[PDB]
Structure formats: C-alpha cells, structure tokens
Amino acid sequence: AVQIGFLLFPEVQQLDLTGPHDVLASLPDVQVHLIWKEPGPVVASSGLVLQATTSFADCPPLDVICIPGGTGVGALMEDPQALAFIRQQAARARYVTSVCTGSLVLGAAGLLQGKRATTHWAYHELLAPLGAIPVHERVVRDGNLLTGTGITAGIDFALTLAAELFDAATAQRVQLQLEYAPAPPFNAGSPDTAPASVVQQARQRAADSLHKRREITLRAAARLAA
Amino acid sequence: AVQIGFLLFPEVQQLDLTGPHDVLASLPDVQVHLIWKEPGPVVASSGLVLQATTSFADCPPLDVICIPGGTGVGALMEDPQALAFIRQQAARARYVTSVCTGSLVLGAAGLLQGKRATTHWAYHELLAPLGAIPVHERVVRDGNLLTGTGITAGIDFALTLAAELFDAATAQRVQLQLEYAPAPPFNAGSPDTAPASVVQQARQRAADSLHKRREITLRAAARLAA
Numbered sequence: 001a002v003q004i005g006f007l008l009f010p011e012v013q014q015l016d017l018t019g020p021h022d023v024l025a026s027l028p029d030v031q032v033h034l035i036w037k038e039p040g041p042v043v044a045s046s047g048l049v050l051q052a053t054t055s056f057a058d059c060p061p062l063d064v065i066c067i068p069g070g071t072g073v074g075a076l077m078e079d080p081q082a083l084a085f086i087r088q089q090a091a092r093a094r095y096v097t098s099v100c101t102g103s104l105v106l107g108a109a110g111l112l113q114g115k116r117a118t119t120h121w122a123y124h125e126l127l128a129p130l131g132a133i134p135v136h137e138r139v140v141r142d143g144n145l146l147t148g149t150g151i152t153a154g155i156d157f158a159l160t161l162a163a164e165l166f167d168a169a170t171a172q173r174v175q176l177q178l179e180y181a182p183a184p185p186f187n188a189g190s191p192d193t194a195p196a197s198v199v200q201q202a203r204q205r206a207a208d209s210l211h212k213r214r215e216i217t218l219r220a221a222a223r224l225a226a
Numbered sequence: 227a228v229q230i231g232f233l234l235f236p237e238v239q240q241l242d243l244t245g246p247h248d249v250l251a252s253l254p255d256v257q258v259h260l261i262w263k264e265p266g267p268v269v270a271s272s273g274l275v276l277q278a279t280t281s282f283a284d285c286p287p288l289d290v291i292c293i294p295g296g297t298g299v300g301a302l303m304e305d306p307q308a309l310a311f312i313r314q315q316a317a318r319a320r321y322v323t324s325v326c327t328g329s330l331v332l333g334a335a336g337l338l339q340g341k342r343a344t345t346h347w348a349y350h351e352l353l354a355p356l357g358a359i360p361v362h363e364r365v366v367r368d369g370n371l372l373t374g375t376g377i378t379a380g381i382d383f384a385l386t387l388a389a390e391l392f393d394a395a396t397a398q399r400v401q402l403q404l405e406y407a408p409a410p411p412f413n414a415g416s417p418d419t420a421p422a423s424v425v426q427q428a429r430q431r432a433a434d435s436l437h438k439r440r441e442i443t444l445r446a447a448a449r450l451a452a
C-alpha cells in the first residue's frame with residue numbers, strides 16, 4: 001500500500017490538510033496517516049478538533065509527505081523534533097509536498113536550499129533567507145518537491161499525484177466521483193487580481209504575523225548556516 | 227453573532243463540511259457549530275475522526291444550516307430525530323444549504339417540495355420522487371435554499387453567503403487571505419466533460435449505492451405522502 005502522511009499540529013489551517021486527505025483517501029491501496037508527537041486530539045486554528053493517528057516514532061516510511069500551513073507554522077519552524085522527522089522522511093519519500101505556509105517548515109528543515117518554491121503571498125519574502133529560489137506561481141515543482149499556494153492547493157496537486165502514482169484515468173475517475181469543478185463567485189484569490197483596497201486590508205491584517213515570522217525565519221536561517 | 231451550523235453524522239464526506247467550515251470560521255462575529263445527537267467523536271467515511279460540539283437539544287437557533295453529503299446520507303434519510311431537527315431549524319434560518327448528496331436529506335425532510343434543487347450527478351434521479359424540480363446546475367438557489375454539487379461546493383457558496391451576510395469587500399478579503407484560486411489539472415469533474423470510459427467506471431462503482439438509495443428514497447417519499 002502507498003503510505004501517505006500529513007503532519008497535524010496545533011493551530012494548523014485544517015483545510016490545507018483535509019482537502020488532500022479526502023481526495024487521496026479515495027484511492028485504492030493507500031494508507032493515510034495523521035502524524036504528530038503522539039496520537040490524540042490536535043486543535044486547528046478554527047477550533048475544529050482533529051485526531052492524530054500515529055506518532056513520529058511509530059510512523060512507517062512514507063511514500064508521500066505533506067506539510068500543511070497555518071498559524072501554527074511559527075512554532076514548528078523551531079521544533080527540532082518535528083524538523084528532524086521531516087528530514088528523515090524526506091530522504092526516501094517519492095514526493096515531498098506542502099500547502100501555503102507549510103513550505104516555510106520545509107525551509108526551516110533545510111529542504112528548500114537551492115530549490116524553486118512558493119508560499120502564501122503575504123509571506124513570500126521569507127523564502128529567500130531559507131535558501132530557496134522564490135517563484136510566484138501557484139504550484140512549483142523541483143524534482144520530487146511540490147509546493148503550492150492556496151488553501152485548496154492540495155486538492156489539485158493530489159490529483160496530479162494520483163495520476164503519477166496510478167494513471168490519468170484513475171485521477172479523472174476520482175475527480176468525477178467527487179464532482180470536483182470549482183467556480184468561485186469572486187476573482188480575488190491573488191494580490192494581482194483583487195482590488196487594491198482589499199489587498200491593503202489583507203496586508204494590514206497580516207502585518208503582526210509577518211513581523212513575528214521574520215524573527216523566527218532569521219533564527220531558523222542561522223541554524224541552517226551552522 | 228451569526229450562528230452557523232453543520233450537521234455532522236457518521237460516514238459524512240468530511241470535505242463537504244470542512245471546506246465551508248474553514249471559510250466561514252474566518253469571518254468576524256460568527257459562531258460555528260458541529261451538530262449531532264450528542265457532542266463527541268463522529269467518524270467520517272475516510273476514517274477521519276471529527277468532534278461534534280453541540281447536541282440537537284442544546285443547539286441555538288441557527289442563521290445558516292448546512293447539510294453535507296456522504297455515504298452516511300442513507301441512514302439520515304430515515305432518522306426521524308435528525309429530520310425533525312432540520313425542519314425546526316429551517317423554519318427560521320436565513321439560509322438553508324446543502325452540499326452534494328446532502329440535498330437528499332433536505333428532500334427526505336420535506337424541504338424540497340416544489341423547489342428547484344440539484345445533487346450529485348450519480349443520484350440526480352432521486353430528486354423528483356422527493357418533490358423537487360431537478361436542475362442540472364452546480365449551484366441552485368430557490369428563495370433561501372441553496373443546493374450545490376461537488377465536494378467543494380460549500381467553499382464557493384460560503385463566499386456568496388459572506389458577501390450577503392456582510393458585504394462583497396469582506397468576501398473578497400477572505401478569498402485573498404486564503405489565496406483561493408483553484409486550477410484543477412484535469413477537466414473530468416462533470417459527466418459532460420469526462421471521457422466516456424471514465425463515466426462508465428464511475429457509474430458502475432456507484433450502482434450498488436444507487437440501488438440501495440432508490441429503496442430508501444421510496445420509503446422517505448411515502449412518509450411525505452402521508
């Protein structure tokens with residue numbers, strides 16, 4: 001069975017994880033794990049309570065690892081146990097993936113050095129100090145690394161992984177069974193298409209978080225420099 | 227505070243619920259409830275464990291009620307306690323909504339009689355015996371009833387509800403904060419765009435479920451006829 005693992009941490013943005021989970025769990029001969037330091041409840045940033053199924057020590061070797069984003073990324077960027085686990089699994093995984101600010105965790109773990117990558121638009125400046133080549137595209141692939149932007153990035157790239165792990169007809173069948181054909185009623189999902197007034201509001205609301213994450217990023221970069 | 231409730235039941239398709247939950251939970255002055263017969267664990271069809279936060283008896287009057295779909299819809303269509311709760315909340319709710327096969331639950335509760343509605347493509351024939359006017363569109367609005375198709379229908383219609391409960395700039399800001407701009411890598415999300423061979427496979431895999439749901443639908447229709 002293909003082994004797929006998602007890191008589940010306090011203050012995760014749960015949709016970053018639950019989207020790809022439901023798609024990939026629809027495939028035959030997959031096993032999906034929700035990984036944290038021990039099994040048990042983990043609370044997402046919205047208050048939704050999710051259950052981790054396996055610990056770092058008991059997790060099998062993964063074929064796919066996926067790091068979601070969320071408020072909780074700041075703590076993960078300085079969690080040596082989590083970063084060590086990610087590095088160990090990435091060494092042999094067929095696919096290393098992240099959604100939104102999850103790529104900052106890959107960066108803190110050293111896995112973006114010299115690699116093309118993206119992250120959430122408001123935090124994109126933090127990729128370069130972590131050694132990445134920043135790219136402003138919604139899905140960026142460099143070798144076996146896939147990084148994507150948007151809360152539903154993992155739904156789309158899960159269909160790509162289904163086609164490469166199985167075949168295109170399997171991916172299309174899953175898409176059809178889920179009737180997945182999005183049609184947003186607004187076109188404000190990028191700073192290049194949203195009204196300027198909306199961009200300003202969103203940037204102002206992210207400013208305190210960005211300031212705190214600049215500090216964390218510099219400390220994480222210092223650890224990589226040693 | 228605006229009160230938004232999702233029905234959480236065993237064998238739910240969790241993305242039908244977790245998508246709109248994360249969008250709506252991003253809004254100011256909202257309170258979101260996960261409703262079942264009692265608080266506690268509820269297992270989704272994928273095995274993901276979610277927690278219900280409130281019981282039918284303790285749930286406040288809702289401004290928005292949302293019924294997700296999933297395998298578990300068949301049991302809900304004949305659960306008199308759940309159907310009675312839905313009817314009570316729908317009487318005063320500003321918005322009554324469903325995702326995918328959740329509209330079959332609204333149908334069993336009597337809430338689609340004489341109303342335009344949609345559901346998952348493989349189960350669309352079951353709307354007419356429940357009194358609905360079936361429509362083949364991704365989002366169908368009839369008064370305060372919204373029914374949508376696709377596992378991520380509730381993400382899109384949550385942005386519509388944000389614009390009508392608050393204003394368009396608020397909805398656009400949420401879309402931008404989430405960087406929501408989907409771009410599926412295949413175009414097989416509808417039976418009209420997927421290859422014929424894929425449609426056949428999907429229909430064959432749904433056949434046993436459809437047969438069982440034809441039986442349940444007829445019994446539910448008989449209860450409405452009395």
Ligand SMILES: [Cl-]
Nearest residue numbers: 150152406407
């Ligand atoms: Cl997206």
Ligand SMILES: [Cl-]
Nearest residue numbers: 180181376378
């Ligand atoms: Cl969809």
